[PDB]
C-alpha cells in the first residue's frame, strides 16, 4: 500500500549527483587553489588530481550501495558494520548541524548571487538576502512534498542550467584563445593544502547513495550514475579552470571574491549579469538536491529506531515523507538567526572525510566477514585501500590546518552520547514522557494525514 516508490530514472540519478557536486564551488573556489599552488600549471594539475581521487572514492560507494540497498547511504553503511551507536553519532551531527547549515549556506548563496546584478558594486541588503534564502527553502520543501516526479524534474532543469553555464564559460575561454607553468609553491606542505582546498569542490559525490532505495533499477543504475557523472564533472572542472586562465591573470584571481563574475564582466559587457544569475539558479538546484536527499536520511534514521517515529510516516495519496521534509525545512530556517555561519561548518572539516573513510574501512571488514553477500560490483581491493590510506592523511591535514576548530567539532560529536542514552538506551520509561510522545505523534499524524510505511 504505502511506501516510497521507485521514481528515479538514470538521467535523474545523474541529476541528483551532478547537481549537488557542481554546487557553488567552481564559480568562486578557483582562488583557493591558486593561493596554495601559486602557479596556473600546478593549480590545473591538482584540479585533475582530486578529480581522479574523487572517482576512486565514488567507485567504492558504487560498490557499497549495490551490496547494501538501503537508502540510508553513508549512515546505513555504518549501521550495517559498526552497529547502533556509531551510526547515531553520525546522524546526530548531520541532523543538528551539517545538513541544515549546508542547506542554509547554499540557499544564502542562491539569494545573494541571484540578486547581485541589482547591486553590482556593493553588498546585497542582508534583510533581503535572508528572506530570499528562506523563500527558496520553503518553496523546495513544498515542491518535494507535492511529488518526487516534481522534485526530480526540478533538479533535471537546474542540473541542466549548471552544465549549460559551465559550457558557456568554457566556450568563451576557447573563443578568447581563437582571438589570440609559472612561479610554483613547490613545497609539499603548500601542495597538500592546495589539494585539500580543491577537494571541497568535488564534495557531494556520495549523495546518490541516500536515495538508492528509490532508483528504478539500483544494481545497474547506482554504479552507472556515478561513472556517467564524476568523469564528466572532472573534465568540466579542468576545462573551466583552463577557461578562467585565458582571461584572468594570477594576481586578479588571487584577489577577486567571485571569480566567475570577473570572467563575466570581461567577455559579455552589457550582458555580464547572465553569469551571476546562472550562479544563483545553479545554487537553487543544490538546495533542492540537498533537501531531497536529506529528507531520506532522517526518514531512514527513524525507520531504524534511532530517531522519533513521526519522521518515518508517509502521506498516502502523494507518497512523500512529509514529516521528514517539514522537519528538515524548520531545521534549516533555525540557522537563519545566526550572525555568522561558515564557522559552524568549518568545525567539521574532518567529519565528511572521516565518515567516508569509516564507510570504506567498513567495506574491507564486510568483505572479510561476509563474502557470501551479493555483489554486482567487485572493485580491485587496491582502490579501497588506496582511498582509505589517502583519507586517513587528509583527516590529519584537516586538523593540522586548524587544530582548535576540529577539536570544537569533536566536542560537539560527544553531544550525541547524552541524546543516544536518553533516546535509545533509556527505553523512554517515565509515563509522563511516553504518553506525551504518543499524544504528539498521533496529533502530527492527524494534522498532516500521514501513516507508517509497510514492509
Amino acid at each position: 500500500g504505502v511506501t516510497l516508490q521507485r521514481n528515479i530514472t538514470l538521467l535523474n540519478g545523474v541529476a541528483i549527483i551532478v547537481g549537488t557536486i557542481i554546487g557553488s564551488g567552481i564559480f568562486v573556489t578557483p582562488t583557493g587553489v591558486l593561493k596554495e599552488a601559486g602557479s596556473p600549471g600546478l593549480a590545473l594539475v591538482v584540479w585533475a588530481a582530486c578529480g581522479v581521487f574523487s572517482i576512486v572514492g565514488a567507485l567504492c560507494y558504487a560498490e557499497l550501495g549495490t551490496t547494501i540497498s538501503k537508502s540510508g547511504g553513508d549512515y546505513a553503511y555504518m549501521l550495517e558494520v559498526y552497529g547502533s551507536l556509531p551510526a547515531f553519532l553520525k546522524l546526530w551531527i548531520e541532523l543538528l548541524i551539517i545538513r541544515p547549515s549546508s542547506q542554509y549556506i547554499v540557499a544564502l548563496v542562491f539569494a545573494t548571487y541571484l540578486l547581485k546584478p541589482l547591486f553590482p558594486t556593493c553588498p546585497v541588503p542582508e534583510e533581503a538576502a535572508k528572506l530570499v534564502a528562506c523563500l527558496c527553502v520553503l518553496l523546495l520543501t513544498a515542491v518535494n512534498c507535492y511529488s518526487v516526479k516534481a522534485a526530480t524534474r526540478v533538479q533535471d532543469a537546474f542540473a541542466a542550467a549548471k552544465l549549460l553555464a559551465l559550457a558557456l564559460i568554457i566556450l568563451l575561454g576557447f573563443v578568447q584563445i581563437g582571438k589570440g607553468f609559472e612561479g610554483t609553491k613547490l613545497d609539499v606542505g603548500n601542495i597538500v593544502l592546495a589539494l585539500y582546498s580543491g577537494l571541497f569542490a568535488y564534495g557531494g559525490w556520495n549523495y546518490l547513495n541516500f536515495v538508492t532505495e528509490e532508483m528504478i533499477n539500483p544494481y545497474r543504475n547506482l554504479p552507472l550514475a556515478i561513472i556517467i557523472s564524476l568523469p564528466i564533472v572532472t573534465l568540466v572542472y579542468v576545462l573551466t579552470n583552463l577557461a578562467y586562465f585565458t582571461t584572468l591573470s594570477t594576481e586578479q584571481m588571487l584577489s577577486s571574491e567571485a571569480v566567475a563574475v570577473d570572467f563575466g564582466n570581461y567577455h559579455l559587457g552589457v550582458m555580464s549579469w547572465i553569469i551571476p544569475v546562472f550562479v544563483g539558479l545553479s545554487c537553487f538546484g543544490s538546495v533542492n538536491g540537498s533537501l531531497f536527499t536529506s529528507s531520506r536520511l532522517f526518514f531512514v534514521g527513524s525507520r531504524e529506531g534511532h530517531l522519533p517515529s513521526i519522521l518515518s510516516m508517509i502521506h498516502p495519496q502523494l507518497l512523500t515523507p512529509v514529516p521528514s521534509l517539514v522537519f528538515t525545512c524548520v531545521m534549516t530556517l533555525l540557522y537563519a538567526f545566526s550572525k555568522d555561519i561558515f564557522s559552524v561548518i568549518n568545525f567539521f572539516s574532518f567529519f565528511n572525510w572521516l565518515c567516508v573513510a569509516l564507510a570504506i574501512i567498513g567495506m574491507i571488514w564486510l568483505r572479510h566477514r561476509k563474502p557470501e553477500l551479493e555483489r554486482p560490483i567487485k572493485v580491485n581491493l587496491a582502490l579501497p585501500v588506496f582511498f582509505i590510506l589517502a583519507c586517513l592523511f587528509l583527516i590529519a591535514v584537516s586538523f593540522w590546518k586548524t587544530p582548535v576548530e576540529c577539536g570544537i567539532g569533536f566536542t560537539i560529536i560527544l553531544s550525541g552520547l547524552p541524546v543516544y542514552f536518553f533516546g535509545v538506551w533509556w527505553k523512554n520509561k517515565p509515563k509522563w514522557l511516553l504518553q506525551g510522545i504518543f499524544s504528539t505523534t498521533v496529533l502530527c499524524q492527524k494534522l498532516m494525514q500521514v501513516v507508517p510505511q509497510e514492509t
Binding site: 547591486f119 541588503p125 528572506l131 523563500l135 513544498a142 510516516m313 504518543f438 494525514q449 507508517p452
Partner: protein
C-alpha cells in the same frame, strides 16, 4: 509507532480536520506570498548603490 493506516484515515476525514488541513495549506502559501511581498519591498526600498 502510532496509528494504523485505516485507523488514521477513518478519523482524518472528519470535516473539522479536513478544513483544518485546508486552512494550514492556505495560511502557509499566504505567509510565503507575504514573505515574497516583504522581500520585494526591501529590495525596492533600499539604496541602489554608487556607480563606478
Amino acid at each position: 509507532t502510532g496509528l494504523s493506516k485505516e485507523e488514521l484515515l477513518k478519523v482524518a476525514g472528519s470535516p473539522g480536520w479536513v478544513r483544518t488541513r485546508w486552512a494550514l495549506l492556505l495560511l502557509f502559501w499566504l505567509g510565503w506570498l507575504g514573505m515574497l511581498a516583504g522581500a520585494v519591498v526591501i529590495i525596492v526600498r533600499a539604496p541602489r548603490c554608487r556607480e563606478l
